[PDB]
Symmetry: D2
């Protein structure tokens, strides 16, 4: 099993949630959302990681994540690009994430992993699941043992992503927790709860979700997570995968 | 809410199972298989329909007739454009149209005109919203016992993907949605995973090929059905779809 | 490998031929007029021609909403086209079609794309010892078409053709993978390109036909009516295809 | 029409060629390959742009290529590439397919006021290039081109939807066809290149090796492509 932000991530461990809005709106709104999500997960005993990307400038957005981390007292995650200053971001956030469109940029992935922080590596929509083993293997090649593989859908014809549930099983061969992006593999909102239930019933380590105060409304998050936690318990009771 | 073979089928009703071997091998094997599935399904409170396809055509019909009478179960089979419907319809309880015929409206209506329940399989070349048109014309003449069966959609060459959104969309037909768990991969390791996913999304019935290639072994059926029944209880508990 | 068909030769190295016509037979008058028009146009371009028409669409419709003549009346109209206009005629056959009746009238049988995996039925069609245009299902990979074609040819029918019509690309979309035109040459049969169904959006019909002809094919299949191509634009299109076909044959390394 | 490295690019203009090795291997090898490709294109009267990708040492070889061989040079740029340094050396910038949806990066590249070959991602629908190109031209760069490289088709397969070559004419830009990556299987490169040329394109993009086409088979292939291009231009009603 893998350690991450003070809790354990794994197929046999309790499901965790990466959630937050897409982009940082206001310090006031970001702190309200982060606190609301923290309490909801606390009332459901779900380990929680806050996420939001940069609207406000890069430096100002970094401060809002600094204030969320310190005032709300939650771990924070954000994306990085090939031109992101890794040391400045790493001195603020707890989890780095590589976007799907960079998943084949091996050396950028290696630069990200070299920061010695947990990395959520998003599978590209142009990738077959078995190809993730090599992407993940290159990320771990210098000792970073905190890599995760994030499923976000695969291209299906034009302007359509399909969630191939086999990918959740195949990517267990990476030796990493598999995270399911429930709000991006739709990119049409009424399918988000259905697909999240499917992924959790198949068996995953964590959920990734965008929330709205292709997003799931904040006032509907607790009911959905309540149904997902019950589905997760059923998977673990009958699991023959561990 | 639809009635079928002495039980009711629906998203809010207990999950039912259509299962059996691909083709009828021997009368001895058919009675053993049908009897085995009957005892297992009865002990798990799962309404059960035995299925098998075409052993000469005349000989196969009596074997299904002997299964129906000796084992005491409803029986299902497919028919083609050249199947003598009255002869087949006078033996079996449920007709099924193969996926490659789903666009042959003239043939679908002839099948539905037998006034038996019909399991209409969606073609791998069909979008889910197209089943509304297939089912509507199938029901146009009063047959209120039509079901929609998902079996996967083409994904590039030599690959089927199970788009779980189809299970939600086809609810708009007003018919039970059946999930073919053994053809959506046609690769055996994913059968339980994909069955768990579909049941968690919410379906009316399961369709499974079982033998003691893309078949599930008979001696592993009960453990699998146990996990699917638990996932089905979780779906109905939190469902907002009924 | 050389193949004869309706009095002419079909092949990657042979002149391009055309299967064309309306989807369904409307009237005897309309079928004879259309067939006669295409016959003169193809003769004046030196393009071997086969007229095609069915009594119902490829996906047969409910009788409660069916527009057209009977199976029997449609068969008679094709006989008069063959006889009055003097052209070879092609039509579809389904699993419930009387093959001997259709075979005694038409020159070329055609199996629809949705039946390509029905080996039993394909073998019965090939047993008629007539030319067969076997359409590739949108759910088939090109290498699977070799097995479909091979089983049809396994007992000596030397007039089998492979017809490409596009493959499923996500929902409600067909893509024309030009690689299949190359792969299916390995069946040892003429490859025919369905230019009006590979889109099933009309703007692309001439473009996709040019592409297929430049890749190298044996024949063209086209739906034309006055995703059908209009009858009064067929000649300009065919003229540009012949120029692209000559260029393909001049530099070809495939034969 | 559009000007590019001293020649005109367009559906109605003669076909041009971007060609070269994937990455700079040797200074010696780059000069030989660029010289070989330059000679071949002259014997066929085909406008030619040399391409290879990389940082300081690789950038230096491409200038010696530009100066010794006397050909225009093209190279890729990434989000962290210093654009001004590369732009002061090469003649044409190229954005890789995986960056096409990074709108702000596309504009930073186009702001160099050099011609730019924007590769369509394998995950993009053709009609989406209209939006990508519009943002690229938004600050006046009238030297943008759209490069087709295939679209994802299931797992581990790229298919060339020839319709995209027609659709992308609506961007108002020359459409370039990548004949050596739309496969990513080597026997199909000439077949697919012929098809794209018969559909009608502005230029060819090709990876060469002394999923690449051998350098000693380039001339026979290009000879057949120029003939197909002439036939397309003779009957074209698209311009």
């Amino acid at each position: 099993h893998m350690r991450l932000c003070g809790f354990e991530a794994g197929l046999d461990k309790p499901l965790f949630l990466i959630a937050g809005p897409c982009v940082i709106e206001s310090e006031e709104l970001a702190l309200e959302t982060a606190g609301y999500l923290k309490e909801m997960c606390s009332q459901l005993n779900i380990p929680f990681i806050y996420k939001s990307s940069f609207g406000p400038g890069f430096e100002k957005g970094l401060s809002i994540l600094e204030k969320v981390k310190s005032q709300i007292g939650v771990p924070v995650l954000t994306d990085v690009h090939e031109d992101t200053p890794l040391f400045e971001v790493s001195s603020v956030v707890d989890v780095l994430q590589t976007p799907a469109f960079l998943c084949r940029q091996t050396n950028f992935i290696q630069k990200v992993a070299a920061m010695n922080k947990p990395v959520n590596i998003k599978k590209g929509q142009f990738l077959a699941p078995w190809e993730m083993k090599h992407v993940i293997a290159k990320a771990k090649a210098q000792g970073n043992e905190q890599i995760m593989a994030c499923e976000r859908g695969v291209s299906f014809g034009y302007n359509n992503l399909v969630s191939d549930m086999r990918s959740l099983v195949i990517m267990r061969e990476t030796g990493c927790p598999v995270v399911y992006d429930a709000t991006h593999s739709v990119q049409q909102r009424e399918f988000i709860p259905a697909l999240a239930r499917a992924a959790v019933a198949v068996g995953i380590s964590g959920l990734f979700m965008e929330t709205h105060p292709n997003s799931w409304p904040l006032d509907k998050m607790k009911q959905l997570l309540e149904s997902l936690k019950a589905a997760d318990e059923v998977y673990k009771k009958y699991s023959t995968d561990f």
